[PDB]
Amino acid sequence: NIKIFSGSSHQDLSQKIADRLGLELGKVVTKKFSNQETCVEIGESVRGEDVYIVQSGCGEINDNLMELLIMINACKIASASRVTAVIPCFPYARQDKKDKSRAPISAKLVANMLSVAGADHIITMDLHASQIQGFFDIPVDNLYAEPAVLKWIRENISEWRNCTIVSPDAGGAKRVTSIADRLNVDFALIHKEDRMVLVGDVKDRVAILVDDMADTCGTICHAADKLLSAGATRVYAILTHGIFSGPAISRINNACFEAVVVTNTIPQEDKMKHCSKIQVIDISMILAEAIRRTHNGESVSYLF
Amino acid sequence: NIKIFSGSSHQDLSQKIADRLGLELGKVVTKKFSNQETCVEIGESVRGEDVYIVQSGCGEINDNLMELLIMINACKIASASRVTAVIPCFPYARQDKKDKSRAPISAKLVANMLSVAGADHIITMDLHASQIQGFFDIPVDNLYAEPAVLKWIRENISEWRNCTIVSPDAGGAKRVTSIADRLNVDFALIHKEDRMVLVGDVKDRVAILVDDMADTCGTICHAADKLLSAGATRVYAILTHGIFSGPAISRINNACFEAVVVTNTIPQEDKMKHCSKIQVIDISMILAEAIRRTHNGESVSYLFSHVP
């Protein structure tokens, strides 16, 4: 009844999920014709089935989005009973408002496309902005890595009871005060005027930079420099989505991070060979459990 | 009231169209981010304007499509009066049916995406299947290269009154009979079974292979061989959309074509440097006219049989 399919070549997360559910990944032929068009071909009947498509990680965000939309549509017109998009890192999430510019709200565009493609349900993790659930009219389950992150901090940072959770920017305030409050410790915040300004106390204490995602890491690496300058004993960086593109990886080694922790919402195995301070939190069990619970009418909010 | 924007940095067609309309291309900040995400920023107000966005021919179809969708979205939420997508070569057009398989109808998906992004109108040329117009509820103007192709044939092939128009496959039948009937000449059809068969006489005549598009060119190259074997004097290939990916340019250089004729719905300039057989028909005037007619409420259908 449950059928799980994986996006293009990135399959490791998808395989882990299927394993936990006692399933094999559904048969599908996903490629790219010589002329760049995405080719998809569902290799088995999905009629009457509860279908979950786990987004890919072939890096190329537009190819991965189109492959997902095409797979959703194929399953819908092949009479699946329901189609859920499992998208650990939601594409174009940062493009979720105009920001005083004549800009697209591409996150809303992405939501409309998923909907017209035929998605009945979305499962995702740590939306850049919670309001993004409002971009849909279908149910969205937005899972949190927070519980996983707290666990990791307690278990890996000896001085954690007196650390400071630090936001790399002004916009990250809510996220870090949330974490600092759960741990009952201090928080502080960095803002780029450029020069960086720090508000809050970090002197002589472990500093943990926490962010929903890191891309070029230019901001997170500068922040690390600032924190050292302000006398933080040691600096960590905790990111739920480790995009790590461009100079990211070399900026990290080249930085003072005692470690950089991310989830496997994005494949990491390649960059871990090029960066020793990277540790990953496996979130396949959360995702698998969201799917089973989604399938069984069981509570998903428990995992929050 | 009229504002024309180009996708990407492959603005040659876009600039040719703007030029013909007496306009500059609208200002857009259009970059791909670190993590592959497309960035777009409309650099001027489009409020109350009749906006036309011309699809870029970069090559990476998924990037070009998303860029277009994002530009449509930006203009719509910036209160343009109307947004028309000008898509010279329609993406995923060859994915317009199931073909007895558990396949997506990706062309219908593309139409839905264009529609939800907010397109009010589509202008395109030579849809792979005319039924694709039915994939929308908004109006689509599907322009034809045929008038420009007929003119090219009459002005470049001495023996056109005695030639045969040839379809490279079963699905191109109507397209070639249409041309053959207008020229008042014969037609022929190739069908691939791992072998080609030809129905229709081409012996001791010039043969013109006509198709909507050529991609890797395996088919037209094999078709030309076949036609020469059947006694054609020589072989031309005329396509509206020259995708020419993979080994196409190599295949063409080795093929027994006298010439391969395409339109500029897809950029050809770089391809031509490596392939002297390619000749290009400029369709910018046809597109510019469809846009001008559309803005003015004048007849676009005039263009279906007449070269502006």
**Element holding B147 (H helix, E strand):** helix B146-156
A194 annotated to a ligand binding site: no
- Closest Cα in chain A to B71: A104
The 3-state DSSP class for residue B150 equals helix
- Closest Cα in chain B to A243: B35
The 8-class DSSP code of residue A303 comes to G
Q: What residues does B237 pair with on adjacent strands?
A: B209, B260
The two three-digit tokens of residue B161, written as one number: 């009154």
Q: Contact, A134 vs A219, CB < 8 A?
A: no
Query: Which residue type is seen at B200?
Result: G
Interchain contact, B62 vs A59, CB within 8 Å: no
Asked if the C-beta of A71 comes within 8 angstroms of chain B's C-beta atoms, the answer is yes
Tell me the C-alpha distance between B183 and B179, whole Å.
6
Q: Solved how? A: X-ray
Q: How far is CA A87 from the centre of its chain?
A: 8
Query: What are the residue boundaries of the structural domains of chain B, listed by start?
Result: 1-144+282-302, 145-281
State which fold the A145-281 domain adopts: Rossmann fold (3.40.50)
Q: How far is CA B56 from CA A39, A87, A105, B14, in A?
A: 21, 29, 21, 8
DSSP count for chain A of H helices, then E strands: 9, 14
Helices (H), chain A: 12-20, 61-77, 106-117, 146-156, 173-183, 218-229, 248-253, 269-272, 284-296
The 8-class DSSP code of residue B97 comes to S
Asked if the C-beta of A148 comes within 8 angstroms of chain B's C-beta atoms, the answer is no
Contacts of A95 (CB under 8 A, 6+ apart): A103, A104, A105, A106, A107, B37
Tell me the C-alpha distance between B217 and B251, whole Å.
7
CA neighbours closer than 13 Å in the CB half-sphere of residue A174:
5
**Sheet of A186-192, strands arranged across:** A196-199, A186-192, A164-167, A207-214, A235-242, A259-263, A278-281
The 10 Å Cβ neighbour count of residue B94 is 17
- Closest Cα in chain A to B45: A102
CA Rg, chain A, in Å? 20
The 8-class DSSP code of residue B265 comes to T
The 3-state DSSP class for residue A206 equals coil
Q: What is the nearest CA distance from B71 to chain A, expressed in angstroms? A: 7
Q: Name which of B104, B113, B246 is nearest A74 (Cβ-Cβ).
A: B104
- Stated length of chain B: 308
Interchain contact, A78 vs B245, CB within 8 Å: no
Interchain contact, A69 vs B35, CB within 8 Å: no
Q: Contact, B69 vs B55, CB < 8 A?
A: no
Task: Note the CATH number of domain A1-144+282-302.
Answer: 3.40.50.2020
- Stated length of chain A: 304
Matching residue, tokens 């290269």: B145
Asked if the C-beta of A65 comes within 8 angstroms of chain B's C-beta atoms, the answer is yes
Q: How far is CA A247 from CA A73, A206, B154, in A?
A: 36, 26, 57
The two three-digit tokens of residue B257, written as one number: 């074509």
The two three-digit tokens of residue A71, written as one number: 């797979």
Question: A95-99: long-range contacts (C-beta < 8 A, 24 or more apart)?
Answer: A95/B37, A96/A128, A96/A129, A96/A131, A96/A132, A96/A135, A97/A129, A98/B77
Tell me the C-alpha distance between B49 and B29, whole Å.
19
Q: Contact, A56 vs A64, CB < 8 A?
A: yes
Tell me the C-alpha distance between A236 and A142, whole Å.
25
Tell me the C-alpha distance between A257 and A236, whole Å.
5
Q: Contact, B243 vs A35, CB < 8 A?
A: yes
Which of B27, B35, B46, B64 is the best substitution to test chain A (most A C-beta atoms within 10 A)?
B35
**Closest C-alpha to A267, from A24, A54, A19, A31:** A54
Q: How far is CA A174 from CA A128, A211, A212, A236, A288, in A?
A: 12, 11, 11, 19, 28
Q: What is the nearest CA distance from B46 to chain A, expressed in angstroms? A: 9
Q: What is the nearest CA distance from B292 to chain A, expressed in angstroms? A: 26
The 8-class DSSP code of residue B71 comes to H
The 8-class DSSP code of residue A208 comes to E
**Closest C-alpha to A240, from A213, A272, A280:** A213
Provide the sign of the torsion angle of the four alpha carbons A112, A117, A121, A126, taken in this order.
negative
CA dihedral A109, B57, A70, A55 (to 10 degrees): -70
Q: Name which of A35, A36, A245 is nearest B34 (Cβ-Cβ).
A: A245
A to B CB pairs, distance under 8 Å:
135
**Closest C-alpha to B147, from B174, B170, B118, B178:** B178
The 3-state DSSP class for residue A200 equals coil
Classify strands A50-54 and A82-87 as parallel, antiparallel or unpaired: parallel
Q: Contact, A142 vs A85, CB < 8 A?
A: no
Tell me the C-alpha distance between A30 and A40, whole Å.
5
Expressed in Å, this structure's resolution amounts to 2.0
**Closest C-alpha to A165, from A211, A122, A134:** A211
A98 annotated to a ligand binding site: yes
Interchain contact, A69 vs B109, CB within 8 Å: yes
Give buried/exposed letters for A127-156 (b at 16+ CB in 10 A, else e): bbbeebbebbeeebbbbebbebbeebbeee
- Closest Cα in chain B to A95: B39
The 8-class DSSP code of residue B11 comes to -
Q: Contact, B284 vs B17, CB < 8 A?
A: yes
Helix B284-296 and helix B12-21: axis angle, to 10°?
50
Burial of B261 (0-12, 13-18, 19+ CB in 10 A): buried
Provide the sign of the torsion angle of the four alpha carbons B71, B76, B80, B83, taken in this order.
positive
Q: Contact, A191 vs A199, CB < 8 A?
A: yes
**Element holding B167 (H helix, E strand):** strand B164-167
- CA angle B60/B10/B259 to nearest 5° reads 85
Which residues on B lie below 8 Å from A115 (Cβ)? 116
The 10 Å Cβ neighbour count of residue A104 is 27
Tell me the C-alpha distance between A275 and A268, whole Å.
10
Interchain contact, A94 vs B41, CB within 8 Å: no
**Closest C-alpha to B101, from A68, A29, A3:** A29
Asked if the C-beta of B130 comes within 8 angstroms of chain A's C-beta atoms, the answer is no
Q: How far is CA B89 from the centre of its chain?
A: 4
Q: How far is CA A206 from CA A186, A262, A302, B115, B279, in A?
A: 10, 18, 31, 52, 68
Tell me the C-alpha distance between A206 and B166, whole Å.
76
Q: Contact, A272 vs A291, CB < 8 A?
A: no
The 3-state DSSP class for residue B178 equals helix
Q: What residues does A53 pair with on adjacent strands?
A: A5, A85
Contacts of B193 (CB under 8 A, 6+ apart): none
Which of A29, A44, A102, A216 is the best substitution to test chain B (most B C-beta atoms within 10 A)?
A102
Between the two ends of chain B, the Cα-to-Cα distance in Å is 23
The two three-digit tokens of residue A19, written as one number: 């394993």
Asked if the C-beta of A138 comes within 8 angstroms of chain B's C-beta atoms, the answer is no
Which residues on B lie below 8 Å from A35 (Cβ)? 61, 215-216, 243, 245-246
- CA angle A97/B37/A135 to nearest 5° reads 35
Domains B1-144+282-302 and B145-281 share a fold: yes
Q: Name which of B70, B105, B215 is nearest A35 (Cβ-Cβ).
A: B215
Q: What is the nearest CA distance from A100 to chain B, expressed in angstroms? A: 11
**Closest C-alpha to A126, from A53, A181, A179:** A179
Q: How far is CA A72 from the centre of its chain?
A: 20
Tell me the C-alpha distance between B25 and B21, whole Å.
10
Helix B106-117 and helix B61-77: axis angle, to 10°?
30
Tell me the C-alpha distance between B73 and B42, whole Å.
11
Helix A12-20 and helix A284-296: axis angle, to 10°?
50
